[PDB]
Coordinates of C-alpha atoms and ligand atoms in Angstrom, one line a residue:
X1 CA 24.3 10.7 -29.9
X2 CA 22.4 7.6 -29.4
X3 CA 18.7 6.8 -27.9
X4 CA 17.5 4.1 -26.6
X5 CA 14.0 3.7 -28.2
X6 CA 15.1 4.3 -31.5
X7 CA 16.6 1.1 -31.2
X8 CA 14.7 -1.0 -29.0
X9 CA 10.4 -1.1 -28.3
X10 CA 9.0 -2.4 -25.0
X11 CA 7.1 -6.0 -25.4
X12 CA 6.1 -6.1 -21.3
X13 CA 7.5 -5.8 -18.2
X14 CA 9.0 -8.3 -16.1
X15 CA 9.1 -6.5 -13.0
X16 CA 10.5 -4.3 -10.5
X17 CA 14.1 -5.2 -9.2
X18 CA 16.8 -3.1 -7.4
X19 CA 16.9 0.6 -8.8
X20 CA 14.2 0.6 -11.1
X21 CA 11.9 -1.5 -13.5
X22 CA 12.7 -4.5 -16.0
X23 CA 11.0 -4.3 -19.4
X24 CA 11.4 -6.9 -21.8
X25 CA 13.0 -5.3 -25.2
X26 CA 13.2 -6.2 -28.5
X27 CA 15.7 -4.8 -31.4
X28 CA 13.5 -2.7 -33.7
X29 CA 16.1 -4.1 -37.0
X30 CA 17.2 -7.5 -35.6
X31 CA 14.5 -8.7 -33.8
X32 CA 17.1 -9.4 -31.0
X33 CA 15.1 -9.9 -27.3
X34 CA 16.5 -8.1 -24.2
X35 CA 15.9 -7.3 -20.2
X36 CA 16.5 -3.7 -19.9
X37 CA 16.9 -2.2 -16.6
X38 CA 15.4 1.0 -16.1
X39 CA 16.7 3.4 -13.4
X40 CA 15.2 6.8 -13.1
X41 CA 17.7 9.8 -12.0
X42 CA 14.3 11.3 -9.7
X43 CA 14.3 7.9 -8.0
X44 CA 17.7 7.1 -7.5
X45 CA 20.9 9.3 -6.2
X46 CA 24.0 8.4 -7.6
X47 CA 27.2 7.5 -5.8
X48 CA 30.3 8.2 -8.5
X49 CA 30.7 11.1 -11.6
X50 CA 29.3 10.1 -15.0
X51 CA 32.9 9.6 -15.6
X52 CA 33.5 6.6 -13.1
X53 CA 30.3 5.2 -14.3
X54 CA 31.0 5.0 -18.2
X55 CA 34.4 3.3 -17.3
X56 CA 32.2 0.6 -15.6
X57 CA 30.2 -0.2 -17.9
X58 CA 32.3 0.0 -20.2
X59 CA 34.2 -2.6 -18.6
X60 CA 31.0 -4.9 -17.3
X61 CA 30.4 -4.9 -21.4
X62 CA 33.2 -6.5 -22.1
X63 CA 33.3 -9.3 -19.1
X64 CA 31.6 -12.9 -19.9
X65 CA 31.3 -15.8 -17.5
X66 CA 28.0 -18.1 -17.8
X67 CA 27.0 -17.3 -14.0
X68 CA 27.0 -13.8 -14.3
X69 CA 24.3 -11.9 -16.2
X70 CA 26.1 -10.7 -19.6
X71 CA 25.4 -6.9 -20.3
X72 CA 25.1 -5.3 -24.0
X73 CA 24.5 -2.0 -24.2
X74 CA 24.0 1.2 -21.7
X75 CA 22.1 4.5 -22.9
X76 CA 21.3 7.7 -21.0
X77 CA 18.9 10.6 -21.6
X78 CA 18.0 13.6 -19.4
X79 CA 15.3 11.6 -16.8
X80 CA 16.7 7.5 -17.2
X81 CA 19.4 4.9 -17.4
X82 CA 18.6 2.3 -19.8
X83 CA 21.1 -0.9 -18.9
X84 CA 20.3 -3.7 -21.6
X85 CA 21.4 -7.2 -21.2
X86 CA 20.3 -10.3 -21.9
X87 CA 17.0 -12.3 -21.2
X88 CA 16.3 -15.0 -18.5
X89 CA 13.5 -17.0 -18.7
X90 CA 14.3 -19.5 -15.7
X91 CA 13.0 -16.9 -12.6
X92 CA 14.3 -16.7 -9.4
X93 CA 16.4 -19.4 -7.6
X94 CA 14.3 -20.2 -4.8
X95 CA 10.7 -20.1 -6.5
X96 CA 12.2 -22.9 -8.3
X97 CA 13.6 -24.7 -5.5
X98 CA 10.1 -25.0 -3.8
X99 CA 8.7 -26.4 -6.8
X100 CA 11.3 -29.7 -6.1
X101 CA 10.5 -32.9 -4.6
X102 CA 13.8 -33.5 -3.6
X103 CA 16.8 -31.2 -2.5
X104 CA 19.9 -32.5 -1.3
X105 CA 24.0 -31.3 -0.9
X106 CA 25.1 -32.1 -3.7
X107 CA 22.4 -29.7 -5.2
X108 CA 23.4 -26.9 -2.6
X109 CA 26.8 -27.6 -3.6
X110 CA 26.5 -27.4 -7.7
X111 CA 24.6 -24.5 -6.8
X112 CA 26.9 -22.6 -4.3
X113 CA 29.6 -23.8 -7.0
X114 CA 27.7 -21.6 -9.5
X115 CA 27.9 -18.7 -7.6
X116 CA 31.6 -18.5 -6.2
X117 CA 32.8 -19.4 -9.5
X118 CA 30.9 -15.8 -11.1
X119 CA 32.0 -14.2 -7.9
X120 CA 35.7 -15.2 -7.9
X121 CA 36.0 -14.1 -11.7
X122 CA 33.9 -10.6 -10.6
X123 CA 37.0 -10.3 -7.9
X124 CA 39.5 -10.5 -10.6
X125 CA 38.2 -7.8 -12.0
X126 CA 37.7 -5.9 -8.7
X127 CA 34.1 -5.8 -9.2
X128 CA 32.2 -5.9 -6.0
X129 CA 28.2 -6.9 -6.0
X130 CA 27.6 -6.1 -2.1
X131 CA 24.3 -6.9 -2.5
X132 CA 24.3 -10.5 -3.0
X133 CA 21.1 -12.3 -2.2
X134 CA 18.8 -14.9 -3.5
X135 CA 16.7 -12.5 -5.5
X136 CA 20.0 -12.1 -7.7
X137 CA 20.2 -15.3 -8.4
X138 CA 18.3 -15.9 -11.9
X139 CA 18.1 -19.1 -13.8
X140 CA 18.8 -18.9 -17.2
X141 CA 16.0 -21.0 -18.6
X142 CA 13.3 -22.9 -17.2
X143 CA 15.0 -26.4 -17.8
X144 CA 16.2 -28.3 -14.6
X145 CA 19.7 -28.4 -15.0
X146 CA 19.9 -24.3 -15.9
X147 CA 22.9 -22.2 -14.8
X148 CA 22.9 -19.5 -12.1
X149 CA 23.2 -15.9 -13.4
X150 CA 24.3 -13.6 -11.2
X151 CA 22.1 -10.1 -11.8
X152 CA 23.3 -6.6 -10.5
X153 CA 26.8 -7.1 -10.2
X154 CA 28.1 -3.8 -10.1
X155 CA 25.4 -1.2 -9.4
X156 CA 25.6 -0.7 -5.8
X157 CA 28.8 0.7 -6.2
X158 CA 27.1 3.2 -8.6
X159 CA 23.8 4.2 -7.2
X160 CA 22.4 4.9 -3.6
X161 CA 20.2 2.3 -2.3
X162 CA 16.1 3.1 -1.8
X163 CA 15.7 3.8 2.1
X164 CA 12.0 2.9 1.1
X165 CA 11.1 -0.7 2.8
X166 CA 8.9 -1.7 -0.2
X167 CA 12.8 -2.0 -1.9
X168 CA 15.1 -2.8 0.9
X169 CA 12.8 -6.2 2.2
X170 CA 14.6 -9.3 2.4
X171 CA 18.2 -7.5 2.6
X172 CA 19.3 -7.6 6.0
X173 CA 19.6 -11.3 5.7
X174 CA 22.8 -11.2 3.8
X175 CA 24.9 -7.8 4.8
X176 CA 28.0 -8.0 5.7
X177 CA 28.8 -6.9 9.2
X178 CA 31.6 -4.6 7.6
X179 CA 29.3 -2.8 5.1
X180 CA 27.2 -1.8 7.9
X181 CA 30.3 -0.2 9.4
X182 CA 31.6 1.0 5.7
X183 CA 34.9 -0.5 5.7
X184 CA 34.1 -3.3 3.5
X185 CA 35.8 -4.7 0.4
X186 CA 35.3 -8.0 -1.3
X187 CA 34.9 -10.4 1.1
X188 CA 30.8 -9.0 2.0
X189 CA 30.3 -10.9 -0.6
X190 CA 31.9 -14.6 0.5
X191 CA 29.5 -13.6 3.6
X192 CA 26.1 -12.7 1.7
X193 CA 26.7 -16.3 0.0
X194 CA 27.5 -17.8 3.4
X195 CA 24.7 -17.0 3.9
X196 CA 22.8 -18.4 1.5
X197 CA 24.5 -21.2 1.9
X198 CA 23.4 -21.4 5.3
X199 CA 19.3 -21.3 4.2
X200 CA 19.7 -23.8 1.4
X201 CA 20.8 -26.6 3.9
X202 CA 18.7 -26.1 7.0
X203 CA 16.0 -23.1 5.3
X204 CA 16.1 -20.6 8.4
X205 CA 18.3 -17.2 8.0
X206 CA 21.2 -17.7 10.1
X207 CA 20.7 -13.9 11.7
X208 CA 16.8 -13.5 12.2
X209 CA 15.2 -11.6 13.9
X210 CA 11.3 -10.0 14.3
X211 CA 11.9 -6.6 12.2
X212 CA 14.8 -5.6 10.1
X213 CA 16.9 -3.6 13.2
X214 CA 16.6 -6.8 15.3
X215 CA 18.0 -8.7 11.8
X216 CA 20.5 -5.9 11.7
X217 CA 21.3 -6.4 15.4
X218 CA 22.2 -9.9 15.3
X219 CA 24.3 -9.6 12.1
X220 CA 26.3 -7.3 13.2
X221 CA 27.3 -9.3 16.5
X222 CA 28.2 -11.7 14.1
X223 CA 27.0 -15.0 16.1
X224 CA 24.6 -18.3 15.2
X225 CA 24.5 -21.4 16.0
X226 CA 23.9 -24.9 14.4
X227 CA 21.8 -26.4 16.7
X228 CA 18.8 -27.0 15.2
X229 CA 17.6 -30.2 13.9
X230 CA 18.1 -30.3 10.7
X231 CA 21.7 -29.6 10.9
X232 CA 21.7 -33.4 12.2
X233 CA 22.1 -34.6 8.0
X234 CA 24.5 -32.3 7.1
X235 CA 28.1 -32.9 6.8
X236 CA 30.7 -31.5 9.0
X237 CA 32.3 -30.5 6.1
X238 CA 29.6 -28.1 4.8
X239 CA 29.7 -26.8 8.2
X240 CA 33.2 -26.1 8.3
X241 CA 33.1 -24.1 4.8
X242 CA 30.1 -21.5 6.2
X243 CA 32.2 -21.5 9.2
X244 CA 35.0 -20.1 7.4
X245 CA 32.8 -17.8 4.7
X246 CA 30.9 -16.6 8.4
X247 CA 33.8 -15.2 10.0
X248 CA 33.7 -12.1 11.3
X249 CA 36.7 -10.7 10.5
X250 CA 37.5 -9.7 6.3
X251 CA 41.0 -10.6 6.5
X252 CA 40.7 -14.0 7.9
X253 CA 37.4 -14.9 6.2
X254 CA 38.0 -17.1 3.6
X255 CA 38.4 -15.8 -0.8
X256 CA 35.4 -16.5 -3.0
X257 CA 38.3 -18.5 -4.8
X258 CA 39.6 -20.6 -2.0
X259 CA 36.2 -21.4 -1.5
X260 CA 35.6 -23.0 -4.6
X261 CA 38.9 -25.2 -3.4
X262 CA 37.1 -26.4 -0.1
X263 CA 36.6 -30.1 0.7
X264 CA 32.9 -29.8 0.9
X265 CA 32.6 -28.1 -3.2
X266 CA 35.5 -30.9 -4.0
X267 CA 33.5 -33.5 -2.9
X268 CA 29.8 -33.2 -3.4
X269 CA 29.8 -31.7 -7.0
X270 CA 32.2 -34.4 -8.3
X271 CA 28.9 -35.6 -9.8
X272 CA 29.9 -39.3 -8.9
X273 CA 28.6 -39.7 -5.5
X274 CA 24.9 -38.0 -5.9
X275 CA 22.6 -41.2 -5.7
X276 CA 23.9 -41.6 -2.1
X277 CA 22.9 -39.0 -0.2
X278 CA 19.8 -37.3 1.7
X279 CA 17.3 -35.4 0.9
X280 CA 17.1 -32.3 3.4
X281 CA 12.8 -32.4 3.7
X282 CA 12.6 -29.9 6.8
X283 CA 15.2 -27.6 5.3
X284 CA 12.8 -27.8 1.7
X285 CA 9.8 -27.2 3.8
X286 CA 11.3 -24.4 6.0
X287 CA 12.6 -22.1 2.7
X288 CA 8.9 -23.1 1.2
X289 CA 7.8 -21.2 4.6
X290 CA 10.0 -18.7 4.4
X291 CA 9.9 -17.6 0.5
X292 CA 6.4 -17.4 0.7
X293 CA 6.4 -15.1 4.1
X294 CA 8.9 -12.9 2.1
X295 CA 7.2 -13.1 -0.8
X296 CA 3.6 -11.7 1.0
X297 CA 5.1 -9.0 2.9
X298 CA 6.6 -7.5 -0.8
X299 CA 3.0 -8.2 -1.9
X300 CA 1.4 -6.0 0.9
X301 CA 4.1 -3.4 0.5
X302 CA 4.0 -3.1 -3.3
X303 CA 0.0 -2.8 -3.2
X304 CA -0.1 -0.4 -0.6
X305 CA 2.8 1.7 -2.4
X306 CA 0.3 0.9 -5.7
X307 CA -2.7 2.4 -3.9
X308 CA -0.7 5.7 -3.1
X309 CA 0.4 5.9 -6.4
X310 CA -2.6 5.4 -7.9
X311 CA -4.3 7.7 -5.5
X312 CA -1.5 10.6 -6.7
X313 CA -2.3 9.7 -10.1
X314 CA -6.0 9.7 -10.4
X315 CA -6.2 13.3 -9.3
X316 CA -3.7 14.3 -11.4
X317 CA -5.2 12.7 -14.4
X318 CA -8.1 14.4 -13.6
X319 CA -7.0 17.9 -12.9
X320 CA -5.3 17.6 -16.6
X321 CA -8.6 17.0 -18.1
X322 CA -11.0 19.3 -16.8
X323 CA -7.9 22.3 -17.4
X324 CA -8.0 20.4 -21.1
X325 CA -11.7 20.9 -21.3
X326 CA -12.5 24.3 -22.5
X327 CA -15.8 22.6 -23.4
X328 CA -16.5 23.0 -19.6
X329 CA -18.2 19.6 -21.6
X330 CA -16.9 16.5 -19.5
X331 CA -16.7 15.0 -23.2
X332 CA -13.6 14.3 -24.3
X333 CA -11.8 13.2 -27.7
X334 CA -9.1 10.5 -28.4
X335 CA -5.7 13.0 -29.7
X336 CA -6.3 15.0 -26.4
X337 CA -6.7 11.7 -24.2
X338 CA -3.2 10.6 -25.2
X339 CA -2.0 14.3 -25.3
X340 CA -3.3 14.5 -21.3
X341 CA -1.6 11.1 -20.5
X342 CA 1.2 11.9 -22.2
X343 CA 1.1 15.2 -19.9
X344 CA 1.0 13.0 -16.8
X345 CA 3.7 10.8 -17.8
X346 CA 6.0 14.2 -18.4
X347 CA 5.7 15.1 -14.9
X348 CA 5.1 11.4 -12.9
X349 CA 6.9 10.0 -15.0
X350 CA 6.9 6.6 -13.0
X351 CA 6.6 4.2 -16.0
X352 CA 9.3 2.1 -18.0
X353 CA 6.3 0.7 -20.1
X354 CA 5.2 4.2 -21.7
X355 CA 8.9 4.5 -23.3
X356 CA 7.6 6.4 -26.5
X357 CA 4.5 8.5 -27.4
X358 CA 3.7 5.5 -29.1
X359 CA 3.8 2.9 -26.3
X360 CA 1.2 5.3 -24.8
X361 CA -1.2 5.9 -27.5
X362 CA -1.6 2.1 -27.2
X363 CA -2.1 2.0 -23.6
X364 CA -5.1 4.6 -24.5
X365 CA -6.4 2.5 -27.2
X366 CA -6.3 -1.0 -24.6
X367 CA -8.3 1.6 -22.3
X368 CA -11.0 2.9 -25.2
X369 CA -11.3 -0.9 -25.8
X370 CA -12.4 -1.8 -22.2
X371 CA -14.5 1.3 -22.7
X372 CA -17.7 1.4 -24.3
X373 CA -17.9 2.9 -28.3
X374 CA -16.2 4.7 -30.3
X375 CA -12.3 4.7 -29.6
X376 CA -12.4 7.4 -31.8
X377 CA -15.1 9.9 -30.5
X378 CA -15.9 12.8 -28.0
X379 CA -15.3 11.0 -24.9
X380 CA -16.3 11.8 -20.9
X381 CA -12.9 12.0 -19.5
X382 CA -13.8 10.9 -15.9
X383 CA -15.1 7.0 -16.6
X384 CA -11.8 6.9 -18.8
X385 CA -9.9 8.0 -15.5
X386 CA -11.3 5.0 -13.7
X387 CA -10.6 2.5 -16.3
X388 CA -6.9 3.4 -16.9
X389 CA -6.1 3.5 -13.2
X390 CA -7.8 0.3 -12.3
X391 CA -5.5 -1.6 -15.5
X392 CA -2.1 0.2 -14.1
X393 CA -3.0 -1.3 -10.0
X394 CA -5.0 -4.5 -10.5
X395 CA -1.7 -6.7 -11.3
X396 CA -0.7 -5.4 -7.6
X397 CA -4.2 -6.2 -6.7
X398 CA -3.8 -9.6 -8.2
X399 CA -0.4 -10.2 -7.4
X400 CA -1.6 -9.7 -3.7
X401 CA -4.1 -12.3 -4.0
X402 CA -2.1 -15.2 -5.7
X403 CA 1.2 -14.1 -3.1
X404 CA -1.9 -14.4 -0.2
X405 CA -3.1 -17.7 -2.2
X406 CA 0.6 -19.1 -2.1
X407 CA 1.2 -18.2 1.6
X408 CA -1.7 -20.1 2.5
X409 CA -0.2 -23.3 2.4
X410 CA -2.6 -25.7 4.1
X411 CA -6.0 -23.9 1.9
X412 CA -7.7 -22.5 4.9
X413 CA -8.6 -18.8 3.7
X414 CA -6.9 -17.6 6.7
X415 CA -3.6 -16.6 8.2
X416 CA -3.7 -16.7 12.1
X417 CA -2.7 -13.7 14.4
X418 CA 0.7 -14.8 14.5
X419 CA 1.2 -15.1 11.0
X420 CA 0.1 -11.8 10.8
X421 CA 3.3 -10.8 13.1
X422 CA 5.3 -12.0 11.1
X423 CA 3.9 -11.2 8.1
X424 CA 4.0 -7.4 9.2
X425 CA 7.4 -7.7 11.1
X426 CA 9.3 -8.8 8.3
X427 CA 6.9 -5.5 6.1
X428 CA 8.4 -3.3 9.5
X429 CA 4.7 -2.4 10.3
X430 CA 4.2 -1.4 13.9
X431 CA 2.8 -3.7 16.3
X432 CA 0.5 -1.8 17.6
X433 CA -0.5 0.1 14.6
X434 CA -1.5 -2.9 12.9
X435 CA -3.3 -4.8 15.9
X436 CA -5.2 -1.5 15.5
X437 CA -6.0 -1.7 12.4
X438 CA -7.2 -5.3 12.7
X439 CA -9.4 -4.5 15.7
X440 CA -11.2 -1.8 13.1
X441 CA -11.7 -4.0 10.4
X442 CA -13.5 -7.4 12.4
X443 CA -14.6 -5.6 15.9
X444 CA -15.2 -9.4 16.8
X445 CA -12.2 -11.2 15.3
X446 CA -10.8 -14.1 16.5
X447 CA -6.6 -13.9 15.7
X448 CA -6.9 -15.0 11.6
X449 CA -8.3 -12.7 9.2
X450 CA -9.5 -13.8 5.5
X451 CA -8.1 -12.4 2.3
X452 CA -11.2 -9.8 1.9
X453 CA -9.9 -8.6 5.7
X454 CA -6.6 -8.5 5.2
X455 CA -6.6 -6.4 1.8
X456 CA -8.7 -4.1 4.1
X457 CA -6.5 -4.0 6.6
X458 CA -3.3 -2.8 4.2
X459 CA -5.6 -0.1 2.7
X460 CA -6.3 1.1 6.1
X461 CA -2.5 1.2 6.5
X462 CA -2.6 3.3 3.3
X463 CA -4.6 6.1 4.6
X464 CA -7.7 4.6 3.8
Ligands
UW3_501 N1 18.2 -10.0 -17.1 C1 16.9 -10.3 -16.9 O1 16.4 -11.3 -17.4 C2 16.2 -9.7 -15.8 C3 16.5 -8.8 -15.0 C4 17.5 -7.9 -14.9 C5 18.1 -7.7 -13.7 N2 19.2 -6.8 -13.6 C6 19.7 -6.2 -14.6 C7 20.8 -5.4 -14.4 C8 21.3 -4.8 -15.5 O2 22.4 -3.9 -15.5 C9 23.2 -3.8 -14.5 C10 24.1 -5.1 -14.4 C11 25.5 -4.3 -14.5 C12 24.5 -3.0 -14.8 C13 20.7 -5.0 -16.8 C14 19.6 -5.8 -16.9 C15 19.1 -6.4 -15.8 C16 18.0 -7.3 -16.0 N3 15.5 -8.7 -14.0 N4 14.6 -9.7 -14.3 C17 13.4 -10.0 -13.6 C18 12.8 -8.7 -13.0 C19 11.6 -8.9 -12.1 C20 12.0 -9.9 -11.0 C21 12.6 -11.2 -11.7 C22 13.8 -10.8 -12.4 C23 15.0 -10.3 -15.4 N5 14.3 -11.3 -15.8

């Protein structure tokens, strides 16, 4: 029966998405590139049998629209799902969408277009995403003009959602009243786009709130308003069409495909009438704000998640050299290195990019050539320890820095007090447990911190 590394190696990862990692794959024979999803049993509970699940992807293999992210193959061993589809190269929606000078309806509307139209084909085949959200919106390339691809469209129904706020930030947003409740069917995800709808045209979440309850609070009473300013350009007719995908009630909330048959789509994605028409400037500046206050908060969450883990796997490293080292030496040699490693990896686990023995021995050769002489010699296990840890973090580390960079809009070095509270609200840190925290850091602060301060804060929120 068949495995998935016999067939494909690992090139680099892309990143960390719903249920697992993202490694970009390549086709040991054909050469072919793929994204392959990896989700790891330990992590993630599943919802159905292995029987339900094989009939769905099964299915899912054999589906093709352009919007919706094609899927290829789907292999399974004792610790890992391996889901392998294509490659997009265009990165999320809204990163590219603060890179624009100019954003206007009729590019909300070829773009909303995009969506329903992979959604109401999904609904033919009574697929459900449920999760629909900006982050699931991929471009396919990084031209302009790229098409929408819808990613994750199916799993939800499949595997049990992370309760773990380094995984479920930025969701409440977009949940359906009724999946809160559980009675929900496909019309969560008319909403979840009415929703996004709703950001691309005036850039503030429709439901908000100061932490992800008070989000959860105000989307399940169902109510917002379009009074705010920038709702002065926009058409009644755009207003009327998340009216009807924001209604409470399933039944009477409007089809994906219906929808696509709404005055607002017929009319500004005829693709005649696009030189006349505004440019929404405090909507592009208000998502600008808010992706890069989303895209912090992951930041501070993923680093402090990568200083735990790191933390867990430094000792353990460790331990399995010195019970290695009968030589009682500290010295250590090159086979046993990668036979240790390899021993940490059996029982963490934890990483998509050491997919075969050999995808590991080349991780230890990377850290021999930070290190010193000799890749092959009798090496001092403990300065290797520090060298292959600081590799695995330092993209969190770095990541953190440029997300900190980015969020700092105006180049000051410093986010004020109430940046902070955001910044932390939207993470669901405690008030008054990061207030602490600050106080520790800069006894003599005054409300902004620098980025030196604020990495210290998070590792203080760490447990250290
Ligand atoms: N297809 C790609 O190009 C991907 C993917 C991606 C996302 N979801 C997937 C979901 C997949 O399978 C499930 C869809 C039905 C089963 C298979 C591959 C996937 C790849 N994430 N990513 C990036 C991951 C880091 C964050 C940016 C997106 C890509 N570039």
């Amino acid at each position: 029966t068949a495995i998935f590394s016999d067939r494909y190696k690992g090139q680099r990862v892309l990143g960390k998405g719903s249920f697992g990692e993202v490694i970009l794959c390549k086709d040991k024979i054909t050469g072919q590139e793929c994204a392959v999803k990896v989700i790891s049993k330990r992590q993630v509970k599943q919802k159905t049998d292995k029987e339900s699940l094989l009939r769905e992807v099964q299915l899912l293999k054999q589906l093709d629209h352009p919007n919706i992210m094609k899927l290829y193959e789907f292999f399974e061993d004792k610790g890992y799902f391996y889901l392998v589809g294509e490659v997009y190269t265009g990165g999320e929606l809204f990163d590219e969408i603060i890179s624009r000078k100019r954003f206007s309806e009729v590019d909300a509307a070829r773009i909303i277009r995009q969506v329903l139209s992979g959604i109401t084909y999904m609904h033919k085949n009574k697929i459900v995403h449920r999760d629909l959200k900006p982050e699931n919106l991929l471009l396919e390339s990084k031209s302009k003009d790229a098409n929408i691809r819808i990613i994750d469209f199916g799993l939800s129904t499949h595997f049990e959602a992370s309760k773990k706020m380094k995984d479920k930030i930025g969701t409440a947003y977009y949940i359906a009243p009724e999946v809160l409740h559980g009675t929900y069917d496909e019309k969560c995800d008319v909403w979840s786009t009415g929703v996004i709808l709703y950001i691309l045209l005036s850039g503030c979440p429709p439901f908000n709130g100061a932490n992800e309850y008070d989000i959860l609070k105000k989307v399940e009473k169902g109510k917002y308003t379009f009074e705010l300013p920038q709702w002065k350009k926009v058409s009644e007719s755009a207003k009327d069409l998340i009216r009807k995908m924001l209604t409470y009630v399933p039944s009477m909330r409007i089809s994906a495909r219906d929808a696509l048959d709404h005055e607002w789509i017929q009319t500004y994605t005829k693709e005649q009438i696009s030189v006349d028409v505004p440019s929404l400037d405090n909507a592009i500046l208000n998502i600008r704000q808010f992706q890069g206050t989303q895209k912090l908060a992951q930041a501070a969450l993923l680093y402090m998640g990568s200083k735990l883990t790191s933390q867990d796997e430094t000792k353990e490293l460790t331990a399995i050299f010195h019970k290695m080292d009968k030589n009682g030496d500290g010295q250590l040699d090159r086979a046993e290195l990668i036979e240790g490693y390899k021993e940490l990896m059996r029982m963490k686990g934890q990483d998509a990019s050491m997919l075969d023995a050999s995808a590991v021995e080349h991780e230890v050769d990377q850290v021999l050539d930070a290190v010193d002489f000799d890749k092959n010699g009798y090496i001092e296990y403990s300065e290797f320890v520090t060298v292959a840890m600081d590799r695995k973090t330092l993209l969190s580390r770095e990541r953190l820095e440029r997300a900190f960079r980015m969020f700092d809009s105006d180049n000051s070095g410093k986010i004020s007090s109430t940046e902070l509270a955001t910044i932390f609200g939207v993470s669901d840190v405690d008030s008054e447990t990061w207030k602490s925290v600050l106080s520790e850091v800069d006894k003599n602060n005054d409300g902004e911190v620098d980025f030196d301060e604020f990495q210290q804060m998070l590792l203080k929120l760490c447990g250290n």
